[PDB]
Amino acid sequence: ASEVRIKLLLECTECKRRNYATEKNKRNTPNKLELRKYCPWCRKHTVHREVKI
């Protein structure tokens, strides 16, 4: 982690709860991460969006 490599949360698109924390290099990957992850509230896989930590 640094200034260029940030920490971030992954928010489930369907219920809005933050289920994961991870990182990215925001110079190499300036767009918000979107990733399918298992949401334990929805109890199914769901697109998660990068959200500020």
């Binding site: 982690a1 920490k7 924390a21 991870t22 990182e23 930590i53």
Partner: protein, 64 residues
């Protein structure tokens, strides 16, 4: 005069029915982003303090 209960122990620890001392795992208070789900999960459990340290802590809780 009578002993006072140590309140830092009383707020961190429990004596079980059989006289073990149980506390919360350390290490997930912060800096968690890069910790695996395995580490976060297993740190959510209680654990039994080693016997030497459990004996000392129980002496701090004379009325539990």
């Amino acid at each position: 005069p009578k002993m006072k209960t140590h309140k830092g122990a009383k707020k961190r620890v429990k004596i079980t029915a059989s006289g073990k001392v149980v506390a919360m795992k350390t290490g997930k208070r912060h800096l968690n982003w890069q910790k695996s789900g395995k580490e976060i999960r297993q740190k959510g459990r209680k654990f039994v303090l080693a016997k030497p340290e459990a004996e000392r802590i129980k002496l701090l809780l004379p009325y539990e």
